[PDB]
Design a protein around this ligand. Sequence first.
Ligand SMILES: CNC(=O)c1ccc(Nc2nc(OC3CCCC3)c3c(-c4ccc5nc(C)oc5c4)c[nH]c3n2)c(OC)c1
Ligand SMILES: C[As](C)(=O)[O-]
Length: 259
Amino acid sequence: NECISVKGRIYSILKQIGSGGSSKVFQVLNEKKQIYAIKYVNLEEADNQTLDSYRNEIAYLNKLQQHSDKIIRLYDYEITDQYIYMVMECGNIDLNSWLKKKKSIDPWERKSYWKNMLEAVHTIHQHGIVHSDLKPANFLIVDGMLKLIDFGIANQMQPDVGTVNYMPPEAIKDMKISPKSDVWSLGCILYYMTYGKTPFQQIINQISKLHAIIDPNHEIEFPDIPEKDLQDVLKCCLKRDPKQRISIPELLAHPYVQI
Ligand SMILES: CNC(=O)c1ccc(Nc2nc(OC3CCCC3)c3c(-c4ccc5nc(C)oc5c4)c[nH]c3n2)c(OC)c1
Ligand SMILES: C[As](C)(=O)[O-]
């Protein structure tokens, strides 16, 4: 029977649906029995690099959210020295959880989702943000459109160890990073949605997998399919050289989404 003020308004906690370092997410209801998500962050052992990174996501999320409804809707927020509360639209499920469940994947639905992902990533690119670690859990389903819910500015949040399967090959060759890197990661999300597995899912051993990713002579298999346009989008996304790899503006003019 627990409850939360944000800016005056009192929200009744249904269940918790996410948790991270200091962070919890809750499905909640206002007085009027309407549903929301509230991200709570606990600032009590947080150093200034952590605090500034949080301040940054809020600032950017607030701004970005008015240029696209493919970015999550942030309704309001509270921030003190001890905590952060962020009230936002509640989604049905995160994309990752839904891909694991879903055996079959409907061609038209796949295309609506691709477009949603493109519009989102395109948005952040326009405002200077290169995520470079996109994966399915970064997106929510909210009335059958995907919405971006993380921006690679602060600790990734777990739906109540993470993969390396979506990692771009320049991430691994560093250690100035390109927006292309996002094209790779979306390329992989589409590849899963196309063929039901990610390109290197079968290589369980991680160092092997990283090698395969960064190896130009490790060919990625593209089984033929009815949508010969989709086959091309996967082929252009998953080029290891960022220079030859396709761009988002290019992707938005591509036949897979346009014809
Ligand atoms: C196994 N998991 C499930 O079944 C499930 C997952 C998400 C639900 N809804 C939801 N899950 C969310 O965040 C998740 C936790 C981290 C990833 C998802 C959000 C968020 C959200 C959560 C955290 C965020 N951080 C930022 C910068 O933006 C955020 C937005 C807004 N609405 C949401 N709505 C859900 O319905 C209750 C069920
Ligand atoms: C905006 As781009 C050229 O990294 O897809």
